[PDB]
Amino acid sequence: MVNVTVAYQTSAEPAKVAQADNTFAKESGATVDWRKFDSGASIVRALASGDVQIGNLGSSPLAVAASQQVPIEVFLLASKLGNSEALVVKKTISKPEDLIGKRIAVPFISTTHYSLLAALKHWGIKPGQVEIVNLQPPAIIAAWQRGDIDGAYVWAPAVNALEKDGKVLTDSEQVGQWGAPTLDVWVVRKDFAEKHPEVVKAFAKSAIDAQQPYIANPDVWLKQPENISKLARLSGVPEGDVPGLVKGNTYLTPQQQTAELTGPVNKAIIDTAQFLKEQGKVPAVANDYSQYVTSRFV
Ligand SMILES: NC(=O)CNCCS(=O)(=O)O
């Protein structure tokens, strides 16, 4: 018997169809505990303690984990993040200069904490000029509803909840264009990969297979009602928000997976870690993270 705990997150993306269909468990034969995490920092800790064996991490929590020598490897990309992650603010905040003195929430060292710091740097605003507070996305929604924060840089379901009444000031497609792109990845603990390599391959296969029908023709994929309802259920968003969210990233073919895992992801971690060091969020970094990426499961 193989038991595996998988830490998943709430982005609405096509591989959620494979999760809702239980395809990984069916094809691998493992008993799979899918555990929902509110952001990536807590996933890094659960991977480090051995409580989780496969986890979905943003590129910023990934660089923190790799700088702390957590024994995990990226074995699959989930998505290249675009405007599915966004800074949503009170409507009276009209320009980036209006963020000065405001209370802006982000989950600690998430991709949106990272993107917020990169956006402030791009705008010429020191992070000390903004009251950046650390809250998990459910608490962000609650604080926003009570008017205790002025905005947040968030992903689904918080991003669409806040946008119902707020205004988008920037998003991670823009921040990517400015030179700080962010990614979502899947990582695996080494000891699990050593013992159950065919289960890890089955995970990658299930996720990659599920994204290819979307890549081939987004509009045809999005008009299959069961695709929309499965993502709405697992992300916790209204069905009407799913197409805009799914189109807010790009996804990879199998050829693109192998290409990105053979160099570009390493370079992504190096650059992400460097910026986090400059921003004071990690004490030490490395000039190479090839121990933390592999193409051998795709
Ligand atoms: N993976 C997701 O669904 C949200 N994007 C990354 C969040 S974090 O950086 O891991 O906190």
Numbering used by the authors: 22 to 319
Publication passage describing the model:
In E. coli, the ssuABC and tauABC gene products encode for an ABC transporter for the uptake of alkanesulfonates and taurine, respectively; TauA is the SBP that recognizes and binds taurine, TauBC is the ABC transporter that mediates the transport of taurine in an ATP-dependent manner. The SsuA and TauA proteins belong to the class II SBPs that are characterized by two globular domains, linked by a flexible linker, that form a cleft where the substrate binds. TauA is composed of two α/β-domains (domain I (23–104 and 202–319) and domain II (105–201)) connected by two-loop hinge regions (103–106 and 200–202) with the substrate-binding site located at the interface of the two domains; both domains are composed of five β-strands flanked by 11 and 4 α-helices, respectively. Although, SBPs are usually described as highly specific for their substrate, we show that TauA is capable of binding different taurine analogues and alkanesulfonates, including phosphonate analogues, with different affinities.
We also investigated if larger compounds such as the N-(2-acetamido)-2-aminoethanesulfonic acid (ACES) analogue, that has an acetamido group after the ethylamine group of taurine, and 2-(N-morpholino)ethanesulfonate (MES), that contains a morpholino group, could bind to TauA; we measured an apparent affinity of 7.4 µM and 2.8 µM, respectively. In light of the binding data, we co-crystallized TauA with 2-AEP, ACES and MES and collected X-ray data at 1.62 Å, 1.5 Å and 1.55 Å resolution, respectively. Inspection of electron density maps revealed electron density for 2-AEP, ACES and MES. The ACES with its longer acetamido group displays similar interactions as the taurine complex but its amine group is making additional hydrogen bonds to Asp84, whereas Asp84 in the taurine complex is bound to a water molecule, and its acetamido group is stabilized by hydrogen bonds between the side chain of Asn55 and the main chain amine of Ser10. In the taurine complex, the site occupied by the acetamido group is hydrated. The crystal structures of TauA with 2-AEP and ACES appear to be in ‘disagreement’ with the ITC data since the structures show that these molecules have formed more hydrogen bonds relative to taurine, they display much weaker affinities. Our structures show that upon ligand binding some waters have to be displaced to accommodate the larger alkanesulfonates such as ACES and MES. We also propose that desolvation of the binding site, loss of water molecules, contributes to the lower affinity for ACES and MES over taurine, although they display more hydrogen bonds than taurine.
